[PDB]
Amino acid sequence: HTLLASGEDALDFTQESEPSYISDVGPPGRSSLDNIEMAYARQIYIYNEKIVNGHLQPNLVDLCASVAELDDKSISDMWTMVKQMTDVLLTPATDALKNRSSVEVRMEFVRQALAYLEQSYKNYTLVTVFGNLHQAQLGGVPGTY
Amino acid sequence: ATPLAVNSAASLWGPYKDIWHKVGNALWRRQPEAVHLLDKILKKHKPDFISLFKNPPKNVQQHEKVQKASTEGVAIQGQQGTRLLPEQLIKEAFILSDLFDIGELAAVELL
Amino acid sequence: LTLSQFQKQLLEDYGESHFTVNQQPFLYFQVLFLTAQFEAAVAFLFRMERLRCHAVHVALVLFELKLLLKSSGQSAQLLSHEPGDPPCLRRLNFVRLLMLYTRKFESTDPREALQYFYFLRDEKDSQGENMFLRCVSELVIESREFDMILGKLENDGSRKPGVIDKFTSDTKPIINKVASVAENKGLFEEAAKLYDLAKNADKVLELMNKLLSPVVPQISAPQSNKERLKNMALSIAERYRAQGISANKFVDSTFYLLLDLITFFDEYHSGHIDRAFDIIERLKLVPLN
């Protein structure tokens, strides 16, 4: 340090000169959002930019569900349920009340709701069996039977 | 005029007495010069009271820097340039981190 | 059993007092969502403090997937039923979901309040006014971030973009909507800046004449309302004369005559007196013979 702080006139090397290490970033004052609403707002930024730049419209379910792959398992399963209840082969009509009143789409909502409730009970029966294997007597045969 | 706001969430004592004494001067001493300070401090620290006693969380981007503080050194609010931290203060910061579940930078600001 | 009977039975005849909502809220959300009552499920979930963020993002999903039944008027409650819908369905006031969520951060995080209002890009009211243009015109009017949101004029009279230039290929209708709401709030210096930012050139001078009028005879002290409005009016006059701008000539000639009355008053207040004579005999506001 003493060899560089004796250096600027005859040793041709590093000065003690102003090093601008700090970049433009979201100011760490109070922004009144919280960690979760800021992660959601960031995923909405990551949604709107793709529409503004003329890209393919992304799935907003996966961009929102990746804010529940974080703190709260009950919000993660709530997003898993919202995903299964939005997995619907909707006719591209100009009218949401016609699609929500369709017989076909109301059958599809119940077909997905039953599939969710059945895989929920399949997860519960799996966890009940794997937690109690000595009672369960599962053996080497994979299948729901 | 930027940056530096980066780290004014990590101090687990300095800001909390800064609120408390200025609350006391505004209320129990009834001081007038403290009222346009109180408004600005309450419009600052509304997240803090919305999460009473909630720690700043641990982060790999703090963890790397605290472990590297014996070579690369760490930037501290108020202080010009990066402080080289002793291996003792580094090991003491990870101890406070896993004793309280506070962020690795917040453990260093507390030390 | 039809789905319509089961939807009603859970929402109306059992309800929030059967499903112990203050202890098992996700179970009542699940009961409504698996019965496809998505609007009622959101208008439930959005009541609870820690869950409003999810209730919005589920509504944004249901909106872009065009599943969300929309309530047909701004003034409606957060949930409604409309005079034409099957009696076991409900509708959400989607605008009123957003304007009760953005209103946590409208005055601190307005960059991202604009993003939540961009889902109103397509949306309109019963007058035909666009709900993105409306909600952004209420946002900027209380956040006051005019330079960042709406962009700026730099000293040449070019326009620097703001955050809003991501969301329209013309900002002029929005900037005039905000300038008009600022004028109706009496924010006349800000309305004048916004009318120049949109180059509604007459409306700038229609405000600067009113602003200079009670101020022209005042002493030009440092930081005074005279010295601010004087250098703002000169900044506009230099841009206008450099860009070849001229207006409704009764407003236009009033603007320059108020500027030369400021040079008359300042050359009088300096004690330079004979200069103020050499100005007023040119201005011919008074007779001398």
A109 lies within 8 A of chain C by CB: yes
Q: Give the C-alpha separation, B76 to B80, whole Å.
A: 8
A53 lies within 8 A of chain C by CB: no
Distance (Å) from the C-alpha of residue A122 to the closest C-alpha of chain C? Answer: 17
Is residue A58 classed exposed, middle or buried when 0-12, 13-18 and 19+ CB atoms within 10 A define those classes?
middle
Question: CB atoms < 10 A from the CB of C35, how many?
Answer: 23
First-to-final CA distance of chain A: 76
Question: CB atoms < 10 A from the CB of A46, how many?
Answer: 12
Per CB-CB distance under 8 Å, the chain B contacts of A28 are 5-9
Distance (Å) from the C-alpha of residue C58 to the closest C-alpha of chain A? Answer: 7
CB contact under 8 A, C34 and A44: no
For residues A91, A94, A96, A98, the Cα torsion angle rounded to the nearest 10 degrees is: -70
Touching A (3+ Cβ pairs <8 A), the chains are: B, C
Omega before residue B3 within 30° of 0, cis = yes
Q: For tokens 């007038």, what's the residue?
A: B32
Find out whether C60 and A51 touch, Cβ atoms under 8 Å: no
β-bridge mates for residue B83, sequence order: B74
Distances (CA, A) of C95 to A44, B110, C120: 17, 45, 8
Question: CB atoms < 10 A from the CB of C224, how many?
Answer: 13
Q: Give the C-alpha separation, B111 to B103, whole Å.
A: 12
Q: Between C25-34 and C38-45, two packed helices, what is the crossing angle to 10 degrees?
A: 160
Distances (CA, A) of B63 to B66, B102, B108: 5, 11, 11
Interior angle at CA B97, CA B91 and CA B101, nearest 5: 165
Tell me which chain C residue has its CA closest to the CA of residue A89.
Answer: C65
Find out whether C11 and C36 touch, Cβ atoms under 8 Å: no
CB contact under 8 A, A60 and C26: no
Q: Which of B83, B76, B80, B99 has its CA nearest to residue B14?
A: B76
> What's the Rg (C-alpha) of chain A?
28
Find out whether B73 and B84 touch, Cβ atoms under 8 Å: yes
Tokens of C1: 């059993």
Q: Secondary structure of chain C in the HEC alphabet? A: CCHHHHHHHHHHHHCCCCCCCCCCHHHHHHHHHHCCCHHHHHHHHCCCHHHHHHHHHHHHHHHHCCCCCECCCCCCCCEECCCCCCCCCCEECHHHHHCCCHHHCCCCCHHHHHHHHHHHCCCECCCCCEHHHHHHHHHHHHHCCHHHHHCEECCCCCEECCHHHHCCCCCHHHHHHHHHHHHHCCCHHHHHHHHHHCCCHHHHHHHHHHHHCCCCCCCCCCCCHHHHHHHHHHHHHHHHHHHCCCCCHHHHHHHHHHHHHHHHHHHHHCCCCHHHHHHHHHHCCCCCC
C108 lies within 8 A of chain A by CB: yes
Touching C (3+ Cβ pairs <8 A), the chains are: A
Find out whether C121 and C167 touch, Cβ atoms under 8 Å: yes
Find out whether A57 and A50 touch, Cβ atoms under 8 Å: yes
Find out whether C3 and C35 touch, Cβ atoms under 8 Å: yes
Tokens of C245: 């701008």
CB contact under 8 A, C115 and A45: yes
β-bridge mates for residue C159, sequence order: C153
For residues A87, A90, A95, A99, the Cα torsion angle rounded to the nearest 10 degrees is: -80
* Amino acid at position C272, single letter: H
Find out whether C233 and C208 touch, Cβ atoms under 8 Å: yes
Per CB-CB distance under 8 Å, the chain B contacts of A27 are 2-3, 5
Q: Specify the resolution in Å.
A: 12.0
* Amino acid at position C55, single letter: A
Number of helices (H), then strands (E), in chain B: 5, 2
Find out whether C31 and A85 touch, Cβ atoms under 8 Å: no
B6 lies within 8 A of chain A by CB: yes
Q: Give the C-alpha separation, C159 to C99, whole Å.
A: 30
Find out whether C90 and C71 touch, Cβ atoms under 8 Å: no
Distance (Å) from the C-alpha of residue C60 to the closest C-alpha of chain A? Answer: 8
Q: What φ, ψ does residue A52 adopt, rounded to 5°?
A: -60, -40
Q: Give the C-alpha separation, B90 to B69, whole Å.
A: 7
A91 lies within 8 A of chain C by CB: no
Task: Please name the method used to determine this structure.
Answer: cryo-EM
Distance (Å) from the C-alpha of residue C113 to the closest C-alpha of chain A? Answer: 9
Distance (Å) from the C-alpha of residue C116 to the closest C-alpha of chain A? Answer: 8
Tokens of C29: 């959300």
Q: What φ, ψ does residue A105 adopt, rounded to 5°?
A: -70, -35
Q: What φ, ψ does residue C34 adopt, rounded to 5°?
A: -70, -25
Q: Give the C-alpha separation, C58 to C132, whole Å.
A: 20
First-to-final CA distance of chain B: 28
Tokens of C100: 């009760």
Q: Give the C-alpha separation, C154 to C156, whole Å.
A: 6
- Which of B2, B41, B59, B61 is the best residue to mutate to test the A interface, defined by the most A CB atoms within 10 Å of its own CB? B2
SS3 content of chain B, % helix, strand, coil (to 5): 60, 5, 40
Instruction: Give how far the C-alpha of residue A76 lies from the chain's centroid of Cα atoms, to the nearest Å.
Output: 9
